[PDB]
Scaffold this motif. Structure first.
Motif, short mmCIF file in Angstrom:
data_model
loop_
_atom_site.label_atom_id
_atom_site.label_comp_id
_atom_site.label_asym_id
_atom_site.label_seq_id
_atom_site.Cartn_x
_atom_site.Cartn_y
_atom_site.Cartn_z
N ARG A 14 -32.78 34.17 -25.97
CA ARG A 14 -31.96 32.94 -26.05
C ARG A 14 -32.70 31.74 -25.43
NH1 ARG A 14 -27.31 32.89 -29.24
NH2 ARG A 14 -25.84 34.53 -28.61
N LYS A 15 -33.38 31.93 -24.29
CA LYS A 15 -34.17 30.85 -23.65
C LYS A 15 -35.26 30.38 -24.61
CE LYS A 15 -32.62 29.33 -19.86
NZ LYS A 15 -32.08 27.97 -20.04
N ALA A 16 -35.90 31.29 -25.31
CA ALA A 16 -36.95 31.00 -26.31
C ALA A 16 -36.36 30.15 -27.45
CB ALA A 16 -37.60 32.27 -26.81
N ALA A 17 -35.22 30.53 -28.01
CA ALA A 17 -34.56 29.74 -29.09
C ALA A 17 -34.08 28.37 -28.53
CB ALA A 17 -33.42 30.56 -29.68
N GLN A 18 -33.55 28.31 -27.31
CA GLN A 18 -33.12 27.03 -26.67
C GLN A 18 -34.33 26.08 -26.48
OE1 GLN A 18 -31.61 27.42 -22.66
NE2 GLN A 18 -30.89 25.30 -22.62
N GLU A 19 -35.48 26.58 -26.01
CA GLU A 19 -36.71 25.77 -25.80
C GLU A 19 -37.22 25.25 -27.16
OE1 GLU A 19 -37.49 24.52 -23.13
OE2 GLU A 19 -37.62 25.91 -21.42
N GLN A 20 -37.21 26.08 -28.20
CA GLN A 20 -37.67 25.68 -29.55
C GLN A 20 -36.76 24.56 -30.08
OE1 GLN A 20 -40.36 26.02 -31.24
NE2 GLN A 20 -39.69 25.25 -33.23
N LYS A 21 -35.45 24.71 -29.95
CA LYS A 21 -34.47 23.66 -30.28
C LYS A 21 -34.82 22.36 -29.53
CE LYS A 21 -29.69 24.00 -29.50
NZ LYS A 21 -29.08 22.66 -29.32
N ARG A 22 -35.10 22.44 -28.23
CA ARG A 22 -35.39 21.24 -27.40
C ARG A 22 -36.64 20.55 -27.95
NH1 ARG A 22 -38.30 20.86 -23.27
NH2 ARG A 22 -38.07 19.46 -21.48
N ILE A 23 -37.69 21.30 -28.27
CA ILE A 23 -38.96 20.76 -28.84
C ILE A 23 -38.69 20.11 -30.20
CG2 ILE A 23 -41.15 21.46 -29.89
CD1 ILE A 23 -41.66 23.20 -27.50
N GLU A 24 -37.92 20.76 -31.07
CA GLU A 24 -37.59 20.20 -32.41
C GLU A 24 -36.80 18.89 -32.27
OE1 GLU A 24 -35.79 23.43 -34.55
OE2 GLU A 24 -37.66 24.61 -34.57
N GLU A 25 -35.82 18.82 -31.37
CA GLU A 25 -34.99 17.59 -31.19
C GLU A 25 -35.88 16.46 -30.65
OE1 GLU A 25 -31.95 19.68 -28.95
OE2 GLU A 25 -30.57 19.55 -30.67
N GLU A 26 -36.78 16.73 -29.70
CA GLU A 26 -37.72 15.71 -29.13
C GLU A 26 -38.64 15.19 -30.23
OE1 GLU A 26 -39.51 17.51 -25.62
OE2 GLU A 26 -37.69 17.12 -24.43
N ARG A 27 -39.21 16.08 -31.05
CA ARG A 27 -40.06 15.72 -32.21
C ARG A 27 -39.27 14.80 -33.15
NH1 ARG A 27 -41.10 20.82 -34.33
NH2 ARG A 27 -42.94 20.86 -32.98
N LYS A 28 -38.01 15.13 -33.46
CA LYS A 28 -37.17 14.32 -34.37
C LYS A 28 -36.86 12.96 -33.73
CE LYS A 28 -35.27 18.48 -36.51
NZ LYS A 28 -34.08 19.36 -36.57
N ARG A 29 -36.56 12.88 -32.43
CA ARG A 29 -36.27 11.57 -31.78
C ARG A 29 -37.53 10.70 -31.85
NH1 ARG A 29 -32.78 14.70 -28.37
NH2 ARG A 29 -34.57 15.11 -27.03
N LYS A 30 -38.71 11.28 -31.60
CA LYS A 30 -40.00 10.55 -31.68
C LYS A 30 -40.22 10.04 -33.12
CE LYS A 30 -45.03 11.26 -31.33
NZ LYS A 30 -45.53 10.69 -30.06
N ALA A 31 -40.00 10.88 -34.14
CA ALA A 31 -40.20 10.49 -35.56
C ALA A 31 -39.23 9.36 -35.94
CB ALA A 31 -40.03 11.68 -36.48
N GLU A 32 -37.95 9.45 -35.57
CA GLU A 32 -36.93 8.42 -35.82
C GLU A 32 -37.39 7.08 -35.25
OE1 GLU A 32 -33.42 9.64 -33.70
OE2 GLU A 32 -32.95 11.22 -35.16
N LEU A 33 -37.87 7.05 -34.00
CA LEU A 33 -38.33 5.77 -33.40
C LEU A 33 -39.54 5.25 -34.16
CD1 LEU A 33 -37.82 6.00 -29.55
CD2 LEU A 33 -36.38 4.97 -31.32
N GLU A 34 -40.51 6.11 -34.51
CA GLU A 34 -41.69 5.64 -35.29
C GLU A 34 -41.23 5.10 -36.65
OE1 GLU A 34 -44.43 9.01 -34.76
OE2 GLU A 34 -45.07 8.18 -32.82
N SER A 35 -40.33 5.80 -37.33
CA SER A 35 -39.87 5.37 -38.68
C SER A 35 -39.03 4.08 -38.58
CB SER A 35 -39.19 6.51 -39.39
OG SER A 35 -37.93 6.11 -39.90
N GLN A 36 -38.22 3.88 -37.55
CA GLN A 36 -37.48 2.60 -37.34
C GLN A 36 -38.45 1.44 -37.09
OE1 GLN A 36 -34.50 3.07 -34.33
NE2 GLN A 36 -33.43 4.66 -35.55
N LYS A 37 -39.49 1.67 -36.30
CA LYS A 37 -40.47 0.62 -35.96
C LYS A 37 -41.19 0.20 -37.25
CE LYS A 37 -43.80 0.01 -32.24
NZ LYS A 37 -45.03 0.52 -31.61
#
Length: 101
Positions: A14-37
């Motif tokens: 479960r910790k492994a799946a939670q960490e992977q989710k956290r990495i995917e959400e951070e990657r998506k927040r970074k992509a959203e800011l680059e695409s808005q800019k």
């Protein structure tokens, strides 16, 4: 609970799946800011001004990234005419170069 080896194994999986989710959400927040800019740049700069800034970003990314954020804030304010022309961008770059350059 027991915290026998089977329960620990389940909590670690479960910790492994939670960490992977956290990495995917951070990657998506970074992509959203680059695409808005990029969306804002395409609107507030002419194609030739946006080309000049891209050229600078290749070799001086930190300077160009700061100049972009500045221009987006300046458009946000009513400080500059929009869209910003290649001519106006060159005048802004000359004024920055007068950090004795």
């Amino acid at each position: 609970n027991s915290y026998d080896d089977e329960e620990l194994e389940e909590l670690l999986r479960r910790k492994a799946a939670q960490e992977q989710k956290r990495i995917e959400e951070e990657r998506k927040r970074k992509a959203e800011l680059e695409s808005q800019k990029e969306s804002i740049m395409r609107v507030i700069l002419t194609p030739e001004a946006r080309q000049r800034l891209t050229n600078i970003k290749l070799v001086k990314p930190e300077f160009a990234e700061s100049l972009e954020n500045q221009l987006i804030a300046l458009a946000q304010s009513g400080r500059i005419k929009i869209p910003i022309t290649d001519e106006e961008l060159k005048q802004i770059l000359e004024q920055i170069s007068q950090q004795n350059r």
